[PDB]
Amino acid sequence: KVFGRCELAAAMKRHGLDNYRGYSLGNWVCAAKFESNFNTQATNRNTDGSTDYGILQINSRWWCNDGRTPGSRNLCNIPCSALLSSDITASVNCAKKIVSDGNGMNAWVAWRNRCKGTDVQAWIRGCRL
């Protein structure tokens, strides 16, 4: 599913991602925009042979099982395919763990390079939330 911007905002807020670990909703929406273009089915291979999945491009190196990342972990205890669903619950729950790992949203390189230090509230402006 490809979310609309305000649609994703509302879904993230309902799942309690807004202000989670101190990251306002616009941070999360901006991360999703640049990781996936709001597309839950997004997948991308990394150099190391791991793959990133879903709206927040969660990496199989650490966080989910895809059956093909030898030596990786599965710290969210889920198949990576769960992160591609139209329902973002699994992505949100796993993102909550990731953002709690010590580096905050710097875990998402696209957030660091495209969202951090910008007017992230722009990503939720206009939305009725």
Curated annotation (Swiss-Prot):
Parts of the chain that traverse the membrane: none
Protein origin, superkingdom: Eukaryota
UniProt keyword Disulfide bond, yes or no: yes
Annotated ranges, domain C-type lysozyme: 1-129
Recorded catalytic activity of this chain's protein: Hydrolysis of (1->4)-beta-linkages between N-acetylmuramic acid and N-acetyl-D-glucosamine residues in a peptidoglycan and between N-acetyl-D-glucosamine residues in chitodextrins
Enzyme class (EC, first level): hydrolase
SUPFAM superfamilies, alphabetized: Lysozyme-like
GO biological process terms held by the UniProt record: cell wall macromolecule catabolic process; defense response to bacterium; defense response to Gram-negative bacterium; defense response to Gram-positive bacterium; killing of cells of another organism
InterPro entries xrefs: Glyco_hydro_22, Glyco_hydro_22_CS, Glyco_hydro_22_lys, Lysozyme-like_dom_sf
GO CC terms: cytoplasm; endoplasmic reticulum; extracellular space
Tissues of expression: In the egg white and polymorphonuclear leukocytes.
Subunit structure, as described in the record: Monomer.
Other remarks on this protein: Lysozyme C is capable of both hydrolysis and transglycosylation; it also shows a slight esterase activity. It acts rapidly on both peptide-substituted and unsubstituted peptidoglycan, and slowly on chitin oligosaccharides.
Protein family (similarity comment): Belongs to the glycosyl hydrolase 22 family.
The protein, known as: Lysozyme C
Species assigned in the record: Gallus gallus
Lineage: Eukaryota, Metazoa, Chordata, Craniata, Vertebrata
